[PDB]
Write a protein that binds this ligand. Sequence first.
Ligand SMILES: Nc1ncnc2c1ncn2[C@@H]1O[C@H](COP(=O)(O)OP(=O)(O)OP(O)(O)=S)[C@@H](O)[C@H]1O
Ligand SMILES: Nc1ncnc2c1ncn2[C@@H]1O[C@H](COP(=O)(O)OP(=O)(O)OP(O)(O)=S)[C@@H](O)[C@H]1O
Ligand SMILES: Nc1ncnc2c1ncn2[C@@H]1O[C@H](COP(=O)(O)OP(=O)(O)OP(O)(O)=S)[C@@H](O)[C@H]1O
Ligand SMILES: Nc1ncnc2c1ncn2[C@@H]1O[C@H](COP(=O)(O)OP(=O)(O)OP(O)(O)=S)[C@@H](O)[C@H]1O
Ligand SMILES: [Mg+2]
Ligand SMILES: [Mg+2]
Ligand SMILES: [Mg+2]
Ligand SMILES: [Tl+]
Ligand SMILES: [Tl+]
Ligand SMILES: [Tl+]
Ligand SMILES: [Tl+]
Ligand SMILES: [Tl+]
Ligand SMILES: [Tl+]
Ligand SMILES: [Tl+]
Ligand SMILES: [Tl+]
Ligand SMILES: [Tl+]
Ligand SMILES: [Tl+]
Lengths: 131, 524, 524, 524
Amino acid sequence: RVEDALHATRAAVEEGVVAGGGVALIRVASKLADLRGQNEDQNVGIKVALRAMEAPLRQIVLNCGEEPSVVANTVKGGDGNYGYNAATEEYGNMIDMGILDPTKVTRSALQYAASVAGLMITTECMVTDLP
Amino acid sequence: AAKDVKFGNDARVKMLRGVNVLADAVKVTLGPKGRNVVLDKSFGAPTITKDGVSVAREIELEDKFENMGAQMVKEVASKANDAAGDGTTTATVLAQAIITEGLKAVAAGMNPMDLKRGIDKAVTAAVEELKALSVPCSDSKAIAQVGTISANSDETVGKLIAEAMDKVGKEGVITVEDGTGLQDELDVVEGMQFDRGYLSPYFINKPETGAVELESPFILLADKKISNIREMLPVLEAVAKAGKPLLIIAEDVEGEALATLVVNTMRGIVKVAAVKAPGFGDRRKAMLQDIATLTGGTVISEEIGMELEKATLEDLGQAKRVVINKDTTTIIDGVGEEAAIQGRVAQIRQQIEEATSDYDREKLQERVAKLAGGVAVIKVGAATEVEMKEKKARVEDALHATRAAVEEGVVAGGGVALIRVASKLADLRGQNEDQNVGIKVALRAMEAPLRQIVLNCGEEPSVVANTVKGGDGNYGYNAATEEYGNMIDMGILDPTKVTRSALQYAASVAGLMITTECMVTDLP
Amino acid sequence: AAKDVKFGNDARVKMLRGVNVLADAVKVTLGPKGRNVVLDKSFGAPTITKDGVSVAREIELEDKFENMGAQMVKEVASKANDAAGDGTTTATVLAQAIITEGLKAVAAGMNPMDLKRGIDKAVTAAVEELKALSVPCSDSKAIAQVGTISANSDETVGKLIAEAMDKVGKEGVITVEDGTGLQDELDVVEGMQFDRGYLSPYFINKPETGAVELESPFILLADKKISNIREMLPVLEAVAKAGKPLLIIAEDVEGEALATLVVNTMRGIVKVAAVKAPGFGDRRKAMLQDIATLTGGTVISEEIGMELEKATLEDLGQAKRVVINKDTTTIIDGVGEEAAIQGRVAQIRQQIEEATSDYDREKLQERVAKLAGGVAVIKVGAATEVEMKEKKARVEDALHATRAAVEEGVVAGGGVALIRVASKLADLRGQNEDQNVGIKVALRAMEAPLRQIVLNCGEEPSVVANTVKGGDGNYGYNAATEEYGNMIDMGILDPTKVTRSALQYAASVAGLMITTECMVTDLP
Amino acid sequence: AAKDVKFGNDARVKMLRGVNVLADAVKVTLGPKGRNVVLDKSFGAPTITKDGVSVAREIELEDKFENMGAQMVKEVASKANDAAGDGTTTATVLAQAIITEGLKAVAAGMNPMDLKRGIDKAVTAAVEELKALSVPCSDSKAIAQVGTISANSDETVGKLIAEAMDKVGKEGVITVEDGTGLQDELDVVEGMQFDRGYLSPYFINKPETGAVELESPFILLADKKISNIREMLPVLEAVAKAGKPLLIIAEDVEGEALATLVVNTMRGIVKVAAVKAPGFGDRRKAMLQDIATLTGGTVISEEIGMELEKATLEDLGQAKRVVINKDTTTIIDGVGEEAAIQGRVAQIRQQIEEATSDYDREKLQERVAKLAGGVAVIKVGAATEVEMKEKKARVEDALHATRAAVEEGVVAGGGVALIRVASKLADLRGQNEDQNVGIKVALRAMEAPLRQIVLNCGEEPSVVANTVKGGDGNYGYNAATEEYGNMIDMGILDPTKVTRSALQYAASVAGLMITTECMVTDLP
Ligand SMILES: Nc1ncnc2c1ncn2[C@@H]1O[C@H](COP(=O)(O)OP(=O)(O)OP(O)(O)=S)[C@@H](O)[C@H]1O
Ligand SMILES: Nc1ncnc2c1ncn2[C@@H]1O[C@H](COP(=O)(O)OP(=O)(O)OP(O)(O)=S)[C@@H](O)[C@H]1O
Ligand SMILES: Nc1ncnc2c1ncn2[C@@H]1O[C@H](COP(=O)(O)OP(=O)(O)OP(O)(O)=S)[C@@H](O)[C@H]1O
Ligand SMILES: Nc1ncnc2c1ncn2[C@@H]1O[C@H](COP(=O)(O)OP(=O)(O)OP(O)(O)=S)[C@@H](O)[C@H]1O
Ligand SMILES: [Mg+2]
Ligand SMILES: [Mg+2]
Ligand SMILES: [Mg+2]
Ligand SMILES: [Tl+]
Ligand SMILES: [Tl+]
Ligand SMILES: [Tl+]
Ligand SMILES: [Tl+]
Ligand SMILES: [Tl+]
Ligand SMILES: [Tl+]
Ligand SMILES: [Tl+]
Ligand SMILES: [Tl+]
Ligand SMILES: [Tl+]
Ligand SMILES: [Tl+]
């Protein structure tokens, strides 16, 4: 519990800490709603990514037994570092409640997940060994 | 016949599977954001409809046990239709939600008999809470508002109903028929309506209405049980002679005489319709002669020396159009002498004076009010023929909604009435833990109608239902405009009667189905 | 390796099915009215036993998912055995009852995480209530009563234990070995016991005990990690020369050196046994030299210039019998100079004087008390050889029960202790409805042990459990005599420790199993 | 290994089916009107035999569960053989009859634990009743009668036994070996017999006897556990040098050293045989030196400075033929100085004088009586070689029957002893109804041995058993002559010991099998 704590603190210095509970991404989602591409197909590509940013929060709520749709809708209505605490089933300021994620980890989690999805969406042919 | 028998958990899962087919086929047609259901016919083109009744009627499954389940909840939909005419889909979505959640508890290991009592207590309390939430329609100005929004924002429809109810009263009899020309007509003619229905469902020649209709029909009256058709033959012989329809009002019609008229009418030989006599016992014999002088016939009771064999056109009662529902018969505009009509009216208004008992007073008053009061007729005026059709089809429904708006009132629509009741009964408890869950099953079932409308609208039902519960009163969701607000102000409203019927009936069947342990059906 | 993955309800039913096999195979052997379970062996005759541990160990299912379930609750039975030595069957009957009723709630649609917390809170409260119901064994007269009834009404057994505990104390170390002749002997010899176990389970040469045993074993001591066997070779070369067993006490034994000794011992070449050093850090280096002068060896830490290659019999510690459990090692009667034993004892009794901290005082006191205090030895006296066997087998168990009778005490047997706790926690509630059921699951699980004993006795469990609940206190059912009465007065009692272990462990696994959603295993 | 588990009724029917195969294969060989059972061998001709043991040994079923059943009752047959040598078929016919009728009651819905106790009480009473029916053989004239009829009316056999028992006594040791010439010889030579058996069954080089035999064998004596073969090697090196067999008497022989001698002996390299030391504890160390001076070896206990590596032929004990049964070892005619034999005898006859305790007196008396008393040898005299065979094979059995005739006596044969006990225990009752049936099961099982003999004789068993029950005393049925009469007068008799063993053992297994609820075996 020192090894992990050092790893989190390391990332807390390099890039900082954002609001946890997957609210950081869902907060970014509402702030990029005006973002557009070059054609209609690119425009959907953005909306795919923005609706993907809601999923981490939605998944935590699903494990908590509560309806993810209701909770995500409430978090989006309020602004800032206002989120859902799944441990206590209480809403409030995430930073004040000690729920936080190092910015570095959330940046890595998003970038990498997009990198592979990008490669997989552009896949047309697959070659493997015969059963 | 060899039978198949299933027990317990094995037997129940076949019902649930069965009801889920009928429910899912009907629940898709809920609300104004509803979907179309296509029903196949052997002859030509398929029928595309949103009518939850038409869809329900068609469902019949292969697996005999599944079929039973489906056919059980179907019996409710049709009965909700019999009570109000509206809310058949709303009944079915409720029934499913009580059954699905109910059976879950039974399978968890809870007492079905305690679960039923939990539901019924929650319902009796919900009907009681619903009456408090109801906004009555008293004056003829608020009555016009209900007839307008029910006929798709048509002010001409609501104006006619208000004028019709101002003539015969709120208890009075109102009927709609085809128009003569270009303007809507309204007359009050000498007629009567009583509480009996068709003695067989094979007389329904207006399948859309689900009722019987006879133009200028000759009417028969006799106090006795018609079993042999021998006595009917000379009457039927003279009816196809000068071909006009025939109404049979008797103590009853049994076996041989009855089962002949059915294959008789469908083949095309003679238009017939059979109904039990009005009332029972003493009033039976008087309400017949009440019909008689309303129609201009004769009572042929087998007493003085009168038979059905020597009964001609001369001995029969004539009226210029009759309608017979499942449990409603009405004779519009009969013959008879008007002075001998008031001469029969004053023959019974004289009884009330000598009425030494207060019960006679009750049942002598019901006669005259519908006998000298009469029956109203709304003749629907349109220019083109296709416009004459739709204006009739949107007055009939509008009258049915207005009828219920007077009797019990109107609650907030959008399925919010039930979801408002749900939050107000959260403190309700039973006698044991098993009863307590039975209540919570019923309360979570009341959320389903709203949730289903939102599902059809494409929006997430969980989000919308959660928002409606947070706000209070007649605040709900408009699925047509995708806007929140006051339902009453937006014209979205349901007659209290239809929502009460939809809930009660759906609970009644679910209660019976939850307490099911054994099923017996024919072998495949 | 290709894997098979099952989710949710599908995944859980495979566990339940799996645990139900292991449980039903073990629950039949509960109580004194228990049934025999026959276990097949490839070589010769089958084993007929009532021992719930032996039956549990053998269960391993074909369906990989079912196997997992079974193997999960098996991990508890064995761990209950590790904590007390008793109540392995009682653990398993509990675990089943929590799982079966738990999963029922999950399938009904309740939060597993709330169900777990409900169970654990009910358990933490039950352990707390159990301590209050416990009747302590303080004086050596009531200690004799427990050792008597545990060894089948034998007064000679209980007398020996009481005399042994009067010599070394309640915290003192007591060991049983084979007798010399016709009378029971009791000496206190210079020995020590510490909290480490066998570094591999393949040294168990007494399968019934589930432990290791070495007669006149040579002992090795070195502070470092033994990974290569190169350094061990010259030591092992001189041990088969004058063939006597060998005890390896080191910081640890890793990989190559360890995995060789296992195929070494089972083949028959050299009797070995490997154990981690006593304690960690600072006391590690001192408790080694505490063993050293207890045994008469030397600490060969790689500091001054000492290696394991130049380490003969001369540099090794000798003792006249050692035992090694899973988590218990004990060196009985070592060599060393007695004056240099007290010379090492007074080298550490001198530390307590200079002990500027109160923690040193704690961990300098534990050394000497088990070092100059010693280890007791009960030499079992019998006439015939077959009588020498059973008297040993009924002292070992009797000592284990008496040990637990001192540490936590004894509650009322017959599974009434738990059923008494059940009625006293009926007012216990959680935070939400789902937690509330979690408690009621645990309380109805506490009834099962009693109910299972009654089932084996042939009587209806429902009737007997209902009668025990009506009466209060230590009033229960005697399955042997089919009589009701005071359990304590009838000699039917369970050490509090075993019942606490049986409940806690069974809840711990059920808690983990209820919160299971996904299972991953190898493909068939 | 994946396992298959069956429960309850399903599990039991597989046992019954299993035992019925073994029983029906053995019960056909009962009595003198018995049938032949043919046993196949891979090498050459099949074996035709009537020996119930040889048939039992061969049975092993395909269905793993059935096999278990069969293998369970097989364990009894072999154990009855170990107790008496006779009545293995009579045991098996009893066991079946208790199991078949027992399981019938269990399936009817009766408590197995009450059924077992009912049987065992009926048995304990039957053994008690059997002792009363027994006619003892005291004088050496009635002892001659038993040895005569057991060896097929041969008077020469019975004369030798009586003369042998007149030399060493009734407790004395009597052995038979091959003759030198034409007359039967009888000498009393210095020897001893003790209560230990072969440490492995793979030394049996006389398969018909089921025992080990070594001609002029060298004997080893050491008090310690032989685990490594390193210490044995120099001893074994000098034995194949001047090739003579070897007897290993030690505290024990463990693992590596033991499992080598087995693949050693069967290959053909060195004739070995391993046995535990005589007695345990103190007498262990003295009875070794009791063997020593009986044999002329030395005790090589690891005390003074003596090892097994420096132990030559010179340090070993010599005797001129040893036999080792499963639980019987006997050293016939050893070396040693006769004056130092009486010098060791008077070294222990001196102990009894100083014996301050009465227990020493008991266990110092057993030594000398079999040490200075000796062992008898009957050298079988015949003319031809084939006649030398059979005369040996009919003295060995005749000695075994006579042995049991002295210890407990002889009851009436023809299975009438048990059927006589059956009628005398008809008033015996248990504690509840279920126990009462348990007794009646055992009593109807006692009829089966007789009934089976009659079945082989071709006559109806029901008729004969009914006739035997009507008459009283030692009146029974002679199956050989098809005549009724006094069994004792007709020479038909069974040693009480064999009938007691046959009943007790058959009940012991049936008791365990009736209380079976779960079976665990390997997957097919
Ligand atoms: N009380 C809480 N309420 C809501 N979210 C929480 C709470 N506590 C932690 N979290 C969120 O939990 C998320 C992390 O989930 P984890 O289970 O740690 O999975 P992970 O970090 O992706 O991978 P692992 O399993 O740690 S290697 C973080 O983004 C936190 O924001
Ligand atoms: N704009 C609206 N927004 C939300 N709900 C509406 C709206 N308009 C009507 N409703 C609801 O629609 C529900 C009725 O659905 P319908 O489709 O009429 O089904 P039904 O009445 O159960 O049976 P049928 O099909 O009429 S026979 C009523 O309860 C209204 O509250
Ligand atoms: N005469 C009796 N009547 C009722 N219960 C009894 C009686 N004697 C013992 N018991 C109960 O028997 C229970 C123990 O059953 P056991 O067969 O010992 O199973 P276990 O202790 O869980 O595991 P094993 O098999 O000993 S390793 C104890 O809780 C006693 O309360
Ligand atoms: N002439 C006879 N008539 C009736 N019974 C007889 C007669 N001769 C012997 N017996 C009975 O035969 C029974 C013994 O049967 P055996 O064939 O010897 O089987 P067993 O003794 O059980 O086992 P084996 O085969 O000897 S190892 C004895 O109990 C005798 O009572
Ligand atoms: Mg509608
Ligand atoms: Mg126990
Ligand atoms: Mg025999
Ligand atoms: Tl929750
Ligand atoms: Tl609809
Ligand atoms: Tl007419
Ligand atoms: Tl929409
Ligand atoms: Tl047990
Ligand atoms: Tl040693
Ligand atoms: Tl019983
Ligand atoms: Tl035989
Ligand atoms: Tl020899
Ligand atoms: Tl015969």
